[PDB]
Amino acid sequence: GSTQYNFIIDASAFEKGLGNIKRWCSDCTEAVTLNFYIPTFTLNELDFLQQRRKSFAARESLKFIDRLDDSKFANLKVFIEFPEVLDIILWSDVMEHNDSSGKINIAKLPKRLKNLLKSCIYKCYLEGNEGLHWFLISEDPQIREMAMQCNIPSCSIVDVDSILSKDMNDKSFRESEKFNNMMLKNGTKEESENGREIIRTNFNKTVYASRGTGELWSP
Amino acid sequence: AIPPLLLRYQDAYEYQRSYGPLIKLEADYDKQLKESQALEHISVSWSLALNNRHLASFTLSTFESNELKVAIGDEMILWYSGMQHPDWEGRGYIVRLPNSFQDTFTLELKPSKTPPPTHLTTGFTAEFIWKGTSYDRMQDALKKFAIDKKSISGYLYYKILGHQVVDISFDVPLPKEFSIPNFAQLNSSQSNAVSHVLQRPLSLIQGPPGTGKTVTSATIVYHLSKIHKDRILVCAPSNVAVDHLAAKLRDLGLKVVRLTAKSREDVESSVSNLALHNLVGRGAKGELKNLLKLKDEVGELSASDTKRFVKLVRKTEAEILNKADVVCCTCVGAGDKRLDTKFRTVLIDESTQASEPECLIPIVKGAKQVILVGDHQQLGPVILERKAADAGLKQSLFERLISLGHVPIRLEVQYRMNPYLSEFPSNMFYEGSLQNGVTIEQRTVPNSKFPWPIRGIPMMFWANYGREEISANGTSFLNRIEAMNCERIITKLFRDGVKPEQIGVITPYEGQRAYILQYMQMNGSLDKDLYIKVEVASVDAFQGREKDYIILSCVRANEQQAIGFLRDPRRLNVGLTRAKYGLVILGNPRSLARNTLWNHLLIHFREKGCLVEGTLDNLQLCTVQLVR
């Protein structure tokens, strides 16, 4: 396909969302082009989880990354970071994108997280950009908070899965879109104290979601 | 060939295909385990129940207490085969389960033409009859969620699937005051929780230890009952939690109906006056009143009277369940045939102690609004099958919703323990948010003579340099020096006037539990009868409960600095939040300090001046080097 997503994927995204990522690679590369960048942080953190925490999801993620790097798949690009790039990227280049008013003490972060920020800034703003728009995929709130402070756009696995369902135009996207427009039609829009988009609805008027057809597991 | 648990599911069919095989794995493992247990040779002690039925008591040594998923009311067959009497079989029901003090199960035998061989003690085997009802309901709930569009609202369906749909709230009249008049006032944390929940289709409440989740949950149910003017379904994985919540709801003036299985109708309860079967019996008149009296004195009914009896009971049960303000039952109990009606508002307490398919059972009854109460920082569900647990069945619905971005509202004022005891658990597991609802003066003993390292700080980490041993099974560890030190602590508490009921000993290893119990019986300074009343168990036994004094025996001490499942943050959290007045931790800091969680604990104890070593009467600061 002609639409292209450019992602830097962290370790938590693999450990928690490996099944979702596998589906993106095999099914979604029809009308979408996926472009992954695997930083050194990811490989080191997945190795730590597999060895010190006996995480079988982290073991499977490392095996999957090897399969991605060995295959010449259509509409899927994967680049594993060369560790020596971390010594070339300036920490001052990361600090130029950091919000001073931000609550996180960026210079006091551990080595692993300092290097993850270097990888992100390299892709988002430096030589690794290639005229593309990059997003960090993470399932760790601390990682997403530090990325936001350094103007690195980030998303969750669910955020990407929803975006790729829209492009694929599957029944999951279409039926959720009907539900959204049903709420917009019957219900009052409000800006909550949190700043969020809330829709007041009547408790007594409920919309049920069509299930469609499908196969159930049987013993 | 099983699909992994995903973050977002395409549809509820994929959701079912993921959880379905995991339920089967658990079911098969549970069933197979009981098949093996049926081969163990047991000793039976006979007695007579008040109703004059025979009681068979016995100990099952093959499996650990947590591995045998046996409930009161469960049917069993007791078999004799030997050279002292012909072959004999007897069917009965479980009336007592093992506790910390009683290692025995008690089976009440059904009356028969052939009497039981009460003169024999050995030659018996016990076979639990497999029902599978709990797992069947979980499977049915998964399937109903997939194919029945009316089982749950569209919004909740999308939220459970991990989909991104616009957030909605209910146009509902909020009360001016959240605390209920004529009743004890909620604190601001509790009040904020009730406030946040009332207009949301889905809420998560986190209730740390001693923070008042019962009064908060009962107040929520009370307001939702007044707002919707409809039945509310209230659930929890365990019967004790259901009874606790039902009692509070009844105290608020709500018409509560407590549904128990037909198997447990004779179980002793604090809320027996709310049991559906007792409400049928008491509120019966006419033909039903007669059929009940007849069945009580005759013990059996004729074919025509049984059909008539069943018809009338069902009709009465439905009328009682329909007129109720709240229906209370366990999560699995929600799947009962008698509750095949609609429940639009559901509150699930202790939802973190159930698997996701177990929580689904009460939610697939036409739910529009769901409140899940729990604590992912405390104990999770019991998953016997490791492959199923590894595949993700240990994750509750409360925890998956957190991974999906749902922030729980936390109750932050604890009323259980001395402020000194709540500090580390609060900082470590609750981001330092816990405040104290009780003072140091409310949790102190004025004339205490106990050798606490610092007077006024009722905690200590008593370092010992003993080494772990291996028990008679080969599968467990013990620590003879820590067991000896444990007795010295207890005796010292006894000398200070503390009663055995006030003391609890928590140890992760069955080897240590058995050794501590035996050791205090033979080498306890004071009367052995005092020490037997001191509860020695694992964290599971103390989950949801409290003691005035807690002794933690870590057991683990080796040159490799390996500590096994002492690594568990959730177990450590529960073990540190059980005490009200005092805490003593026994352990070897040298090996515990390699673990980063335990290293933070030792540093906290050292900062308080509580990390000590030596003789109890001449304690010294522990010399171990701790490096962060």
Residue numbers in the entry:
A (entry chain B): 0 to 218
B (entry chain A): 224 to 851
Show me the paper's own sentences about this structure:
Among these, the nonsense-mediated mRNA decay (NMD) pathway is responsible for the rapid detection and degradation of translated mRNAs harboring premature termination codons (PTCs), which can arise from mutations, transcription, or processing errors as well as alternative or defective splicing events. UPF1 is made of 2 structured domains: a CH-domain known to interact with UPF2 and an ATP-dependent RNA helicase domain (HD). Nmd4 is composed of a PIN domain (for PilT N-terminus) and interacts directly with the helicase domain of Upf1. Nmd4 stimulates Upf1-HD ATPase activity and strengthens Upf1-HD binding to RNA.
Here, we describe the crystal structure of the complex formed between Nmd4 and the Upf1 helicase domain of S. cerevisiae. We tried to crystallize this complex in the absence or presence of a short RNA oligonucleotide, but only obtained crystals of the complex in the absence of RNA. The crystal structure of this complex was solved to 2.4 Å resolution. In the Nmd4/Upf1-HD complex, Upf1-HD adopts a conformation similar to that of human UPF1-HD bound to UPF2 or ADP and phosphate, with the largest difference observed in the orientation of domain 1B (rotation of this domain by 17 to 19° relative to the RecA1 domain in both cases; ). The Nmd4 protein is composed of 2 domains. Second, a C-terminal region (hereafter referred to as the « arm »; residues 168 to 218) folds into a long α-helix (⍺9) followed by a two-stranded antiparallel β-sheet (strands β6 and β7) and a long unstructured region (residues 202 to 218) to embrace Upf1-HD. In total, 39 residues of Nmd4 interact with 44 residues located in the RecA1 domain and in the stalk of Upf1-HD to form an interface area of 2,050 Å2. As a result, a parallel β-zipper is formed between strand β7 of Nmd4 and strand β8 of Upf1 at the interface, generating a three-stranded β-sheet common to the RecA1 domain of Upf1 and the « arm » of Nmd4. The side chain of R210 forms 3 hydrogen bonds with the carbonyl group of F368 as well as with the hydroxyl group of S374 from Upf1-HD, while the W216 side chain stacks on the helix α1 and in particular on G243 of the Upf1-HD stalk region. In conclusion, our crystal structure reveals that Nmd4 interacts primarily with 2 structurally important domains of Upf1-HD, namely the RecA1 and stalk domains, and to a lesser extent with the RecA2 domain.
